[PDB]
Amino acid sequence: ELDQLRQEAEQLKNQIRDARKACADATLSQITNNIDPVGRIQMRTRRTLRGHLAKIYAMHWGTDSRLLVSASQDGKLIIWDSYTTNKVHAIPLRSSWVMTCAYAPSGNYVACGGLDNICSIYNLKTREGNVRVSRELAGHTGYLSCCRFLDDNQIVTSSGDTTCALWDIETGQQTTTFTGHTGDVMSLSLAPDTRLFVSGACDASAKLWDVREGMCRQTFTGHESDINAICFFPNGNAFATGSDDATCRLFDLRADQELMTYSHDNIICGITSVSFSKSGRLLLAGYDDFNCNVWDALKADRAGVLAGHDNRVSCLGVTDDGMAVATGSWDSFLKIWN
Amino acid sequence: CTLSAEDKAAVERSKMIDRNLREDGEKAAREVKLLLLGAGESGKNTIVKQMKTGIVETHFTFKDLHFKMFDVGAQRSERKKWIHCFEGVTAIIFCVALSDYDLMNRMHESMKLFDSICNNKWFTDTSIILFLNKKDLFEEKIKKSPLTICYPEYAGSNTYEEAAAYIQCQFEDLNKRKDTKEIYTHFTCSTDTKNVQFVFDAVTDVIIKNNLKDCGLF
Amino acid sequence: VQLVESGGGLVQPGGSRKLSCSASGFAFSSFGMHWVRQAPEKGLEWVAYISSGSGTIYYADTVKGRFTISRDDPKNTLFLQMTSLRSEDTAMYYCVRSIYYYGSSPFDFWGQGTTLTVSSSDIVMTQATSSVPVTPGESVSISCRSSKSLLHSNGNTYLYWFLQRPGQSPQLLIYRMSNLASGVPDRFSGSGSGTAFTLTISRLEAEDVGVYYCMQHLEYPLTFGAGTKLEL
Amino acid sequence: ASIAQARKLVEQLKMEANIDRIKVSKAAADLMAYCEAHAKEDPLLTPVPASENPFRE
Amino acid sequence: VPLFHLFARLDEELHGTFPGLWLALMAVHGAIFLAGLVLNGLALYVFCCRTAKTPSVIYTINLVVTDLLVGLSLPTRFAVYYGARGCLRCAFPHVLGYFLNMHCSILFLTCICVDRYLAIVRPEGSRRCRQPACARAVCAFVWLAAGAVTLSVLGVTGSRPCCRVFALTVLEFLLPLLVISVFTGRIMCALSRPGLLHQGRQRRVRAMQLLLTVLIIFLVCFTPFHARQVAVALWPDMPHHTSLVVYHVAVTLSSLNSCMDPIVYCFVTSGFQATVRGL
């Protein structure tokens, strides 16, 4: 019966809440209250990559931390050289509606995807000299919101049909499908060891998914609205989510509960992108009040504002070597702050 | 200078890439993009058929104008999480079946969707080419089934001539930003070969209004 | 990919001949193309270069003004209209594709080349060895010394290695002195810094028998090296 | 019908119970320790000198 | 031349031979200075500091810059006359208000009308990359052209029939008037094209009404100066009192452009009016 099962369902939820409350004895602020604050941090626009003629919707830094790709609504997938300004590749998309992009760890492949419900894998290193389509992954019944490359043959895609899927590029089929979400999955981030990943969805809950076992492992609630962004801590034992209620939250993998609440009274907009620093001290969040923000990830204080954009910030990314942070806004431009 | 041969050739390649990107953007700037947002398959397929997965795209040229219709209804997701991708569309071609007033009612849900689209933050100044599609079946069924089934407050007679006017005015009622948006209602027939003509007329009027607004005349 | 060559033959001194290099298979419009001559008894030598989209165009000091080079992206053909022939132009002309972006491999594929028989501040690179007898399975080191250090302020030495098996066109082995070209075995390994460069072969087989050349790529008057022929 | 999804939901919630949980204090201590042990090479907390900065404006 | 000696002498002689007319002239100049600065100041504050950069916005921004600058220069004539009496060689910067109100302002109207024609009837591929950068390029070129034209016309050759007594008149009342008239007529022909929807008839009516209002303002603000400049050349038979009262009436009427131009270029815009109402 529905109520008969709901009885022990709510009993188990209460037991989980009681265990989470009993595992807490002190907040993160109470622990790291005696640490020297990071102080005010200044950021200057070192480079300004221009050339897009529409809204920029995603961006991913390469492993070498010099190449970066950007996806925009005009149908272009520009690959930038970030140390200089000049471009490398200009890939005309089949469908102009793209909301996510990715860069392979080996640098040979770049992904895309959007309202066409199809993830496209582009082979950059071709003998023929032009960027082709290596595979066109179909099988999602909703818009793709975030795709991340596991390796050169596996990609984890998160779609708007409340499902995340693990693919195989050569075969083209879904190796594993991660069910359990009730709202539209909006963002994705893999672990440093690429054996776990977390996905945030519109039902204000982020779940830890085992990419090898194939089922959800933990459930993290706490947000009051849609989770537009998510990112793992560099240690892999934590991750930070940015929701639509002007609040970034830090979750713990082993404590399995709240750690921090990075919210300010002067912001009522919605976080669109979240990324961490190399040492995990500076949590960068791209907000909807036209500028990015910097948060001390151990305290709750601010550190600086990356105010250099005309339209809102949609994508954020800190390089693998930790040198710079790039914010790509909705107007036309990506700015490489450092 | 202080650039080697490879950096100079890379700069030349990026210059050429930006040149073709600018050319493609200039080509796509003159091309009209229309959002076809119907309700419950109330004439989407018929409207697409009489002229010219995820997003269905249809492009057609009609007497020195390139149009682009984005059929959306095959999404079944949260509309507010991707409806901001359609900023800057020239018009929002709606589609409403008049015969669905006696089918909780389909016309009431059509009104709800029209209110949700008119009172939308992103579409605060985009005109709506409303298309009352099924008028023949409405004309045949209006003699037997009265409009009081759908509208208990109706005071008009049974004839289609004023019933269609009541439907049109009720559909224009839910508009709130009347100073920016203009709803170009039209009635579609089976033999109506001028639906694309009315789309062209409404799009030219929208373009003229946009040019007047940019020039300061409006 | 393919680059089939048409032209050559007996040309009188002071005449004119027109060499057609018709690409087939790859994106010819995105590829800067070169020409590389080779005398019947000497090493390789540079000729000219057109950037992508017929932009910048350079020439060697010897062939400046006499040679004109053009491309036709419609037909995927690229030409070399050369004037004022003499006995010094008796060579075999390879057209070499080269695409320049960050991380690319210029000079990766070489055309077949047509021989041309005529009736009767450059960074010099020195390879003192000209013939190294060796047995298969023995590690071989081939040294290349320049006159000016190729290490630009960016941090990459623009030195290139090539291998010319007897009877076929050269192929890129090492690009930028420390990067393996795609399609070659992993035994090859180039190294060095400044003006002294060496290439270390781990294991040798029967297909490694061939001449080994050098390219500088700092400024566009590129100078080849006296090829150190490898043989058993 | 509306039974199988309830069954799998309650099974997932049952298998969520036996997840090992540690103290929040020691988790925060580990977070802080990793935060301070890698702060020397981080180019964000400590502004790097402009000589070795690859984005030299 | 040199003519500005003649304008200074005409002002001095009108002061000498007409007390009531001079008093009315000061009253009118003060009224225009009061009215022509608050409106222009509000327009420049709500464009340059509140608002997208379209070329028409740049054109009207530099136009209201010229209008405010010549509003400032309007009291400079009186200040130089009262303080620095005589020394006609000193009398350049105050009489150089004809550079601003009459010379540089008139063909900015033609520039705006050219942009309106270029945008309404035929964009022609966005005018082959029209762009704000080239809009500022044309603005700088037209500034240089106005500066070159205004400097030479003062002392070119002399005499009534020759020199710039007629050359300036034709140069700034035949090319600008014909350009504005023909482009307004072409736009009115385009906006009355038969086969346009009846829903948008109300906006185009206001559009060509605004264009006709701009043309009428131009025709009523700048015609008496050039008309009297023609009259003093052809028929010296009329005497000096008419030739001074008509000259100063025409100068004041050209100063009325400082009050009627920015309202009809900024306050009648629906977007700017809504922005001002909402803030």
SS (H, E, C) chain A: CHHHHHHHHHHHHHHHHHHHHHCCCCCHHHHCCCCCCCCCCCCCEEEEECCCCCCEEEEEECCCCCEEEEEECCCEEEEEECCCCCEEEEEECCCCCECCCEECCCCCEEECCECCCEEEEEECCCCCCCCEEEEEEECCCCCEEEEEECCCCCEEEEECCCEEEEECCCCCCEEEEEECCCCCEEEEEECCCCCEEEEEECCCCEEEEECCCCCEEEEECCCCCCEEEEEECCCCCEEEEEECCCEEEEEECCCCCEEEEEECCCCCCCCCEEECCCCCCEEEEECCCCCEEEEECCCCCEEEEECCCCCCEEEEEECCCCCCEEEEECCCCEEEEC
Residue C68, both tokens: 């004109």
In DSSP notation, chain C reads -EEEEE--EEE-TT-EEEEEEEEESS-GGG-EEEEEEE-SSS-EEEEEEE-TTS--EEE-SSSTTTEEEEEETTTTEEEEEEES--GGG-EEEEEEEE--STT--TT--B---EEEEE------EE----EEE--TT--EEEEEEESS--B-TTS-B-EEEEEE-TTS--EEEEETTTEEPTTS-TTEEEEEETTEEEEEESS--GGG-SEEEEEE-SSSS--BB---EEE-
Contact check, Cβ <8 Å, B217/E196:
no
A334 near A292, Cβ under 8 Å? no
Residue A113, both tokens: 């995807």
Domain definitions of chain B by residue range: 31-202
A71 near A100, Cβ under 8 Å? yes
CATH 2.60.40.10 fits C125-226, yes or no: yes
B116 near B39, Cβ under 8 Å? no
Output DSSP code: residue B39: S
**Pick from C37, C224, C3, C172: nearest CA to C115:** C37
Q: At what angle do helices E3-17 and E55-83 cross, to 10 degrees?
A: 60
Q: Are strands A144-149 and A155-159 parallel, antiparallel or unpaired?
A: antiparallel
Grouping H, G, I as helix, E, B as strand and the rest as coil, residue E82 is helix
CATH topology identical between C2-118 and C125-226: yes
E117 vs A280: CA distance, rounded Å: 58
Unique residue bearing structure tokens 């013939």:
C131
Entry resolution in angstroms?
A: 3.1
- Sequence-distant (6+) residues with CB within 8 A of E104 are E66, E142, E143, E146, E147, E150
Q: Which helix (H) or strand (E) holds B131?
A: strand B131-132
Unique residue bearing structure tokens 């405010």:
E68
Type of residue found at E244: L
> Which of B177, B212, B213 is the best mutation test for E, with the most CBs of E within 10 A?
B212
Query: Which of A55, A90, A161 has the CB atom closest to B21's CB atom?
Result: A90
Q: Which residues of chain A neighbour B25 with C-beta distances below 8 Å?
A: 53, 74
Grouping H, G, I as helix, E, B as strand and the rest as coil, residue E118 is helix
Type of residue found at E5: H
At residue C86, what are phi and psi to the nearest 5 degrees? Answer: -155, 180
The domain spanning residue A291 has which CATH number? 2.130.10.10
Structural domains of chain A, count: 1
CATH 3.10.580.10 fits B31-202, yes or no: no
Type of residue found at C217: H
Q: Are strands A163-167 and A155-159 parallel, antiparallel or unpaired?
A: antiparallel
Grouping H, G, I as helix, E, B as strand and the rest as coil, residue D43 is coil
Q: Is E75 exposed, middle or buried (0-12, 13-18, 19+ CB in 10 A)?
A: middle
Unique residue bearing structure tokens 């993009």:
B33
Mind telling me how many Å the CA of D44 is from chain A's nearest CA?
7
Q: Does C have 3 or more CB contacts under 8 Å with E?
A: no
A306 vs C156: CA distance, rounded Å: 33
| Half-sphere exposure of residue A181: CA atoms within 13 angstroms, side-chain side | 30
Mind telling me how many Å the CA of B7 is from chain C's nearest CA?
8
> Which of A85, A123, A124, A130 is the best mutation test for C, with the most CBs of C within 10 A?
A130
Residue E165, both tokens: 């007594």
Q: Does A336 contact D at CB distance below 8 Å?
A: yes
A12 near D17, Cβ under 8 Å? yes
CB atoms within 10 A of CB B209: 21
Unique residue bearing structure tokens 């106005």:
E146
For residue A52, what are the CA distances in angstroms to A70, A73, B19, E101? 9, 9, 12, 42
Contacts of B27-33 with CB under 8 Å at 24 or more apart are: B28/A74, B29/E126, B30/B66, B30/E125, B30/E126, B31/B66, B31/B67, B31/B68, B32/B65, B32/B66, B32/B67, B32/B68, B32/B90, B32/B203, B32/B207, B33/B68, B33/B70, B33/B88, B33/B89, B33/B90
Q: Which helix (H) or strand (E) holds E120?
A: helix E106-120
Domain definitions of chain C by residue range: 2-118, 125-226
Grouping H, G, I as helix, E, B as strand and the rest as coil, residue B213 is helix
Domain definitions of chain E by residue range: 3-278
CB atoms within 10 A of CB C199: 23
| Half-sphere exposure of residue C46: CA atoms within 13 angstroms, side-chain side | 25
Q: Does D have 3 or more CB contacts under 8 Å with B?
A: no
| Chain A residue with Cα closest to C97 | A129
- Sequence-distant (6+) residues with CB within 8 A of A158 are A144, A145, A146, A147, A164, A165, A185, A186, A187, A188, A199
Residue E170, both tokens: 């034709």
- The vertex-E145 CA angle with E144 and E150, nearest 5°, equals 100
> Which of B180, B198, B215, B218 is the best mutation test for E, with the most CBs of E within 10 A?
B215
Partner residues linked to A159 by β-bridges: A144
Query: Which of A81, A84, A130 has the CB atom closest to C30's CB atom?
Result: A130
Contact check, Cβ <8 Å, C100/B2:
no
**Pick from C159, C189, C164, C186: nearest CA to C175:** C159
CATH architecture of the region E3-278: Up-down Bundle (1.20)
**Pick from A175, A194, A264, A185: nearest CA to A232:** A194
Q: Are strands B32-38 and A56-61 parallel, antiparallel or unpaired?
A: unpaired
Q: How many residues does chain D have?
A: 57
A184 near B77, Cβ under 8 Å? yes
CATH architecture of the region C2-118: Sandwich (2.60)
Q: Which helix (H) or strand (E) holds B166?
A: helix B160-173
| Half-sphere exposure of residue E213: CA atoms within 13 angstroms, side-chain side | 14
Q: Does A have 3 or more CB contacts under 8 Å with D?
A: yes
In DSSP notation, B6-31 reads HHHHHHHHHHHHHHHHHHHHHHHHTS
Query: Which of B30, B205, B215 has the CB atom closest to E199's CB atom?
Result: B205
Residue A36, both tokens: 């020297």
Q: Does B53 contact A at CB distance below 8 Å?
A: yes
| Half-sphere exposure of residue E273: CA atoms within 13 angstroms, side-chain side | 14
Q: Is C110 exposed, middle or buried (0-12, 13-18, 19+ CB in 10 A)?
A: buried
C172 near C107, Cβ under 8 Å? yes
**CA-based torsion, A94, A95, A97, A103: positive or negative:** negative
Q: What domain range is A271 assigned to? A: 2-337
Q: Does A268 contact D at CB distance below 8 Å?
A: no
CB atoms within 10 A of CB D37: 10
